[PDB]
Structure formats: structure tokens, C-alpha cells
Design an enzyme around this catalytic site. Sequence first.
Site, PDB file in Angstrom:
ATOM      1  N   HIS A   1       0.816  -1.215   0.000  1.00 39.81           N
ATOM      2  CA  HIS A   1       0.000   0.000   0.000  1.00 39.81           C
ATOM      3  C   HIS A   1       0.857   1.276   0.000  1.00 39.81           C
ATOM      4  O   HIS A   1       0.330   2.367  -0.211  1.00 39.81           O
ATOM      5  CB  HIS A   1      -1.039  -0.019   1.134  1.00 39.81           C
ATOM      6  CG  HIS A   1      -0.527   0.440   2.464  1.00 39.81           C
ATOM      7  ND1 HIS A   1      -0.179  -0.438   3.470  1.00 39.81           N
ATOM      8  CD2 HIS A   1      -0.352   1.684   2.974  1.00 39.81           C
ATOM      9  CE1 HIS A   1       0.210   0.245   4.533  1.00 39.81           C
ATOM     10  NE2 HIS A   1       0.113   1.535   4.259  1.00 39.81           N
TER      11      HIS A   1
ATOM     12  N   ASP B   1       0.071  -7.578   1.946  1.00 37.21           N
ATOM     13  CA  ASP B   1       0.543  -6.189   1.935  1.00 37.21           C
ATOM     14  C   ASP B   1       2.067  -6.130   2.076  1.00 37.21           C
ATOM     15  O   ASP B   1       2.612  -5.789   3.137  1.00 37.21           O
ATOM     16  CB  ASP B   1      -0.148  -5.370   3.033  1.00 37.21           C
ATOM     17  CG  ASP B   1       0.055  -3.871   2.871  1.00 37.21           C
ATOM     18  OD1 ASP B   1       0.589  -3.443   1.826  1.00 37.21           O
ATOM     19  OD2 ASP B   1      -0.339  -3.116   3.793  1.00 37.21           O
TER      20      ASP B   1
ATOM     21  N   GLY C   1       1.703   7.076   8.653  1.00 37.24           N
ATOM     22  CA  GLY C   1       3.090   7.460   8.389  1.00 37.24           C
ATOM     23  C   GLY C   1       4.091   6.402   8.814  1.00 37.24           C
ATOM     24  O   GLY C   1       5.242   6.442   8.384  1.00 37.24           O
TER      25      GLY C   1
ATOM     26  N   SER D   1       3.388   3.253   8.184  1.00 39.20           N
ATOM     27  CA  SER D   1       3.162   2.295   7.098  1.00 39.20           C
ATOM     28  C   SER D   1       4.431   1.822   6.422  1.00 39.20           C
ATOM     29  O   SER D   1       5.259   2.636   6.025  1.00 39.20           O
ATOM     30  CB  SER D   1       2.292   2.942   6.021  1.00 39.20           C
ATOM     31  OG  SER D   1       0.965   3.061   6.463  1.00 39.20           O
ATOM     32  N   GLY D   2       4.564   0.506   6.284  1.00 43.31           N
ATOM     33  CA  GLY D   2       5.673  -0.100   5.554  1.00 43.31           C
ATOM     34  C   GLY D   2       6.910  -0.352   6.393  1.00 43.31           C
ATOM     35  O   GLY D   2       7.837  -1.011   5.936  1.00 43.31           O
TER      36      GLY D   2
END
Length: 223
Positions: free
Chosen positions: A40, A84, A175, A177-178
Site C-alpha cells: 500500500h 501487503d 506514516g 506504514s511499511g
Amino acid sequence: IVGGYTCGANTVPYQVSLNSGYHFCGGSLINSQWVVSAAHCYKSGIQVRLGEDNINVVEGNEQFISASKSIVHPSYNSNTLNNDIMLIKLKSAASLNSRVASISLPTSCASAGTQCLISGWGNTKSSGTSYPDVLKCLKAPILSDSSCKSAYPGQITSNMFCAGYLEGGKDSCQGDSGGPVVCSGKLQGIVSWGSGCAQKNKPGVYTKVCNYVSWIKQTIASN
Ligand SMILES: [Ca+2]
């Protein structure tokens, strides 16, 4: 990260910032040329920033390297966030040192109750909005599959796990994320999703990296 602590400069040397004119996602360095992040987080024009603490100030340990290619997992579903995960290759190999270092992939999946380190430059507020510029850290346990599924009826797949605190107060957030979830020196998770941040009975949900090690290795071996 909500309810966390200031990590300290370059104390999480595998943590990367993905930048497209601004920080938009975290990632984890897994070798000199490859970063793992969330699917994402996919976009074009990614610069990978390694050796970061304050993402708004050049402090002297950074390496800025443009991505040459991104590979989103073939089975990624953006509606359910199943699978994801995404790989990003750097145009040049990073120079590895004490402050820019790869994180080991898991050889086996981590169990509920395992203590992990979650890190990122995401929002630090559960109600308002405040973005830190230095890296924030959170120590959090992996939660049982049953409690995770009870928290999020109909939404937890075999490629996801919950980590954090059912009482709320401490969580990942927008923020982050990942970014990494590291447990006993292995990358077990990727910050994927949640319902708000640090809310009661709504812990963060993470991509279950141990399910993807074969895909990661084979993809790196041919790209
Ligand atoms: Ca910096």
C-alpha cells in the site's frame, strides 16, 4: 508511533524512510540493494533514505538512493490488504556500516507473546495530529490469532498478525506504514493497517513476513 519513545539516532539501522518529496512510508533494509515495505506504500518516484534520524535535517549519516524498480506482491489485494508487501531495489548498493545495516529475514514465524520493536516517523497522536521528525520506537508483544480476529471480525487473514495492546494507548499510526516489526533480531512484520491508532481493542495489524521469505529470496535472486 503513539505512546512510544525516541529511539535515538541510528539505533534502528535497518529503518528506512521512503521519500517522494516528503516522507510517506517506512521500509526495512534487507540487503545492500533491497528494501521491504508495504504494498500500500507503492508509488513511482521513490527515493530511499537510509541512516536517518531527523528526516528534516541532514545530520551526516544519511545515504539517499533512488529506487530502480518496485515489485508489489503478485497477490496483493488493496481492498482487504491481504499480502501487503512490496520489494524496492536501490539504483546503487548502500554502503553498510553500524548505522546503515540490513535486518535478517525470519527462518520461522514468531509466536504470540513474542516481544518486538516497531518503529517509524508516523503520527504520535491518537486523536490529534503531530508528526515527529526523529524516529520513534515502541516495544510491543505479538497478540494471539484469536484475540486479533476477535478485535477485527472478518478481516484478519493468515498473512496478518496483531501486535500491541488491547487497552490502547500504544500503537503504530499513519506514516509508520511499511516500517519494521523486529523480534529477536528478525523482521517478522510490516506496518500494514489498523482502525485509527492506539484505540482500545483496535491494535495495529502487520504483514506476516515469515510467509513471504521464499518469495522475497526468489525475487531478489532474479531481479
Ligand atoms: Ca536526516
